Paper text:
Here, we report the three-dimensional structure of a ‘Termamyl’-like α-amylase, the AliC α-amylase from Alicyclobacillus sp. 18711. One particularly important subset of GH13 enzymes are the ‘Termamyl’-like α-amylases, historically named after an enzyme from Bacillus licheniformis. These enzymes typically feature a three-domain ‘A, B, C’ arrangement with a C-terminal β-sheet domain and with domain B being a protrusion from the (β/α)8 fold of domain A. The catalytic centre is placed in domain A, whilst the A–B interface forms the substrate-binding cleft. The fold, as expected, is a canonical three-domain arrangement with the A, B and C domains defined approximately as A, residues 4–104 and 210–397; B, residues 105–209; and C, residues 398–484. A classical Ca2+–Na+–Ca2+ triad is found at the A/B-domain interface.
A ‘branched-ligand’ AliC complex was obtained through co-crystallization, with crystals forming in a new space group. This form diffracted poorly and data could only be obtained to 2.95 Å resolution. A subsequent lower resolution (approximately 3 Å) analysis revealed the binding of a branched ligand in the +1/+2 subsites with an α-1,6-linked glucose branch bound to the +1 subsite sugar. Weak density in the −1 subsite, largely diffuse but greater than would be expected for discrete solvent, remained unmodelled. Notably, this +1′ sugar overlaps in position with the very recently reported SusG amylase branched-ligand complex. The accommodation of branch points was therefore investigated by an analysis of limit digestion products (the characteristic oligosaccharides remaining after enzymatic digestion) on both pullulan (a regular linear polysaccharide of α-1,4, α-1,4, α-1,6 repeating trisaccharides) and amylopectin, an α-1,6-branched starch structure. The action of AliC on pullulan results in the production of the trisaccharide panose, glucose α-1,6-glucose α-1,4-glucose, demonstrating that the enzyme must be able to accommodate α-1,6 linkages to glucose moieties in both the +1 and −2 subsites.
Author numbering: 4 to 484
Write the structure that this text describes.
């Protein structure tokens, strides 16, 4: 067993040129050489416009195959182009995880007149008006697809709520459809966080429950997926999501189907809750670790690096942790902007890539850069960290998370991977050394900094210890020369 490494193969500000699937296909053998074992690709189905990033879901049966919303292709390309890309990933032994967006729909084909009440955006449980008629965007007819793959049409009675009355056109409102209840169990911020945006799917209605589990089967079968990435799980009835996932595993026979959910909450408690209510059947993005990386990045050297891993899925539930530094939602100008500055980013990526805890995820925005926000590509130095992970980050780990500035850990090596073993050392502050145990096995061997940040070498004494230096505000990853 080789280490596993995910890559989010998109960012928010990609150009709308229908080329991402093409590119992903080409990149397959390159991704294999740098140690990517799995690729998370963005919502592949038709959004409300050609340029939609994917979260403005229109038709989940249109993988850029049908002419709807004025385009055949999605922002990313055609069903044909996606299938070639997935084949190419598979030919290079890389897993394909599809982004699955179940919370809502938008770009309804027409309005329906329906009775609804206003609820309080701070407390969706509290009603704030009498019933009355609104013009709600709840009619999904799918005219360019007709009945190919599914004749299921969405109407008002399949949604719990909307944020727009077309007849009166008012901001700041959340409408609950008459005789509907916000689903449960959901995140309890705003009393009930079932409603986020668009037309909120009612996961109480059992026609919806069995249609969405069919969609699941069709999606995973049609693209031959190894896994799913689940958008907005905090806003979706936990029991249904737990059964949605075991239904798809069962109906497809992919019973080892990988699943990671976006539960966006800075509190480990909330995440633990979601895991408990879903039988630990899926992993979660380590959002608390991301927040810690940001705090250290903005600490100007004064963050207490001993606390870097506190209150994280990485430390506390490593088998269900998907670790990340930044994503499409945290990048500059997006909704959860919490960017990790350039100087700290290598310390963060060294943390998720050289430690035994977590399934780490490399951001496309980091690897290839974000031109629209003047972010350099980090590919040159990331390649060296990914080399460390692929070929050296193996065997017993020893942790030295024991100073405000300088911290480190070692990996002894396993016999399965030749020459394997490393010592990672990093400082949020001035440069220094740590004496750490890499194993008596390595005695007399000479270590180099695979990052290139330092040109000196460390000789391992016969007790199996080295004294490993790093630069100020940098990281060095030491391996057998
Ligand atoms: O119209 C609704 C909303 O849309 C965007 O929000 C995007 C993100 O919403 C969720 O995250 C919320 C957190 O769960 C709350 O803790 C708090 O921090 O607020 C954010 C949203 O502002 C969701 O879980 C993420 O996947 C979404 O991308 C807009 O930016 C909001 O201003 C709108 O209210
Ligand atoms: O008729 C124009 C356009 O109106 C809507 O766009 C809304 C959106 O739905 C609301 O959720 C909110 O953000 O205000 C926007 C203001 O323009 C419709 O949803 C859309 O289908 C329609 O074409
Ligand atoms: O954390 C487990 C993951 O590790 C690796 O990428 C495997 O290839 C994948 O199947 C597994 O789901
Ligand atoms: O906190 C609000 C919640 O209280 C209870 O748990 C109800 O069962 C649920 O339907 C409601 O929204
Ligand atoms: Ca409901
Ligand atoms: Ca919802
Ligand atoms: Ca410090
Ligand atoms: Na709902």
């Amino acid at each position: 067993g080789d280490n596993g490494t995910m890559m989010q193969y998109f960012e928010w500000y990609l150009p709308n040129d229908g080329t991402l699937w093409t590119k992903m296909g080409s990149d397959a053998s390159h991704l294999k050489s740098i140690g990517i074992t799995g690729v998370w690709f963005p919502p592949a189905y038709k959004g409300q416009s050609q340029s939609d990033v994917g979260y403005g879901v229109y038709d989940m049966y249109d993988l850029g195959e049908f002419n709807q919303k004025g385009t055949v292709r999605t922002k990313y390309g055609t069903k044909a182009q996606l299938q070639s890309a997935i084949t190419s990933l598979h030919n290079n032994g890389i897993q394909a995880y599809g982004d699955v967006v179940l919370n809502h729909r938008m770009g309804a084909d027409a309005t329906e007149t329906i009775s609804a009440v206003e609820v309080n955006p701070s407390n969706r449980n509290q009603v704030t008006s009498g019933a009355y008629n609104i013009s709600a965007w709840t009619d999904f007819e799918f005219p360019g697809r007709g009945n190919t793959y599914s004749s299921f049409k969405w109407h008002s009675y399949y949604f719990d709520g909307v944020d727009w009355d077309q007849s009166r056109q008012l901001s700041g409102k959340i409408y609950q459809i008459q005789g509907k209840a916000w689903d449960w169990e959901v995140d309890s911020e705003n009393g009930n966080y079932d409603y986020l945006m668009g037309a909120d799917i009612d996961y109480d209605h059992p026609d919806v429950q069995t249609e969405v589990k069919n969609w699941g089967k069709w999606f995973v079968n049609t693209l031959n997926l190894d896994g799913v990435r689940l958008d907005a799980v905090k806003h979706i009835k936990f029991d249904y999501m737990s059964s949605w996932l075991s239904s798809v595993k069962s109906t497809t026979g992919k019973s080892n189907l990988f699943a990671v959910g976006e539960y966006w909450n800075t509190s480990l408690g909330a995440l633990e809750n979601y895991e408990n209510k879903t039988n630990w059947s899926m992993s979660l993005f380590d959002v608390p670790l991301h927040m810690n990386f940001q705090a250290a990045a903005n600490g100007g050297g004064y963050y207490d690096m001993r606390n870097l891993l506190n209150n994280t899925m990485m430390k506390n539930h490593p088998i269900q942790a998907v670790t990340f530094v930044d994503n499409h939602d945290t990048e500059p100008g997006q909704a959860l902007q919490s960017w990790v500055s350039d100087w700290f980013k290598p310390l963060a990526y060294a943390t998720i890539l050289t430690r035994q805890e977590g399934y780490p995820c490399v951001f496309y925005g980091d690897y290839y850069g974000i031109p629209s926000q003047s972010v350099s590509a980090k590919s040159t130095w990331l390649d060296k960290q990914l080399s460390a992970r692929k070929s050296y980050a193996y065997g017993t780990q020893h942790d030295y998370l024991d100073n405000q500035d300088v911290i480190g850990w070692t990996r002894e090596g396993d016999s399965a991977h030749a020459g394997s073993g490393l010592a990672t050392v990093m400082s949020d502050g001035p440069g220094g050394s740590k004496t750490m145990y890499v194993g008596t096995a390595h005695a007399g061997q000479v270590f180099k900094d695979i990052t290139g940040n330092r040109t000196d070498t460390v000789t391992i004494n016969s007790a199996g210890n080295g004294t490993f230096p790093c630069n100020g505000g940098s990281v060095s990853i030491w391996v057998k020369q």
